[PDB]
């Protein structure tokens, strides 16, 4: 079959994406504070491990993702998994200035980042990206569009259908902006501002991947089943 994604209109693309959104998971309910280096890293890796399962279900509901061979699907996910978890974290943290909402019951300030060696540097980048999201008034509809772009774009050079789907999402993004009453010039400018943010998400992902591998070497955090495999994906 041809890809049923290309026939979708802007509105159907938007509702298909909002409908695919993964649930928001909770962390451990132990109120023991403050965290140690291991307890902290343990909470985060346990959470991500569980989020990655829902991330995978989410990917399959992204218009045009299942039309790709199993090979490609695997490749795109292994390449962008940390970027996707992070933009999700940045999005959820938008309304909580100076804080990272890893989960409803796990709202961390930058200070708590010091609990883990080398973690505060990453926390600062995530917080700044978060203020950036807040100052631009990022909308949920724009957010799901951005997250889908990371999925399809990050490992796309590592290989026409995918590029046609990206154009679709780009059109969907402008549609959302015209709908918000933005002038032509403001639409193009905003499109640019949003996409430039992906360069930052990528940088954040690279740093966090290295930092996560570090922790692994120290033999601290219990890397879980799926997370470990996703981590190993990066030779």
């Amino acid at each position: 079959k041809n890809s049923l994604a290309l026939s979708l209109t802007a509105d159907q693309m938007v509702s298909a994406l909002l409908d695919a959104e993964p649930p928001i998971l909770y962390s451990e309910y132990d109120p023991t504070r403050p965290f140690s280096e291991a307890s902290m890293m343990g909470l985060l890796t346990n959470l991500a491990d569980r989020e990655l399962v829902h991330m995978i279900n989410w990917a399959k509901r992204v218009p045009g993702f299942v039309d790709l061979t199993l090979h490609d699907q695997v490749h795109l996910l292994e390449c962008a998994w940390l970027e996707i978890l992070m933009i999700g974290l940045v999005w959820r943290s938008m309304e909580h200035p100076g804080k990272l909402l890893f989960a409803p019951n796990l709202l961390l300030d930058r200070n708590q980042g010091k609990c883990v060696e080398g973690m505060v540097e990453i926390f600062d980048m995530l917080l700044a990206t978060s203020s950036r999201f807040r100052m631009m008034n990022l909308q949920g509809e724009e957010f799901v569009c951005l997250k889908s772009i990371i999925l399809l774009n990050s490992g796309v050079y590592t290989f026409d259908h995918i590029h046609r789907v990206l154009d679709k999402i780009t059109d969907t993004l402008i549609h959302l902006m015209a709908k918000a009453g933005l002038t032509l010039q403001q639409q193009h400018q905003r499109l640019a501002q949003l996409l430039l943010i992906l360069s930052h998400i990528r940088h954040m992902s690279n740093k966090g991947m290295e930092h996560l591998y570090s922790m692994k070497a120290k033999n601290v955090v219990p890397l879980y089943d799926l997370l470990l495999e996703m981590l190993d994906a990066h030779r």
């Binding site: 995978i56 399959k60 199993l70 699907q73 695997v74 996910l77 799926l226």
Partner: peptide, 12 residues
Amino acid sequence: RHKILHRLLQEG
């Protein structure tokens, strides 16, 4: 090879 990711991508 064997990957949990394969299991989640296929079992759906």
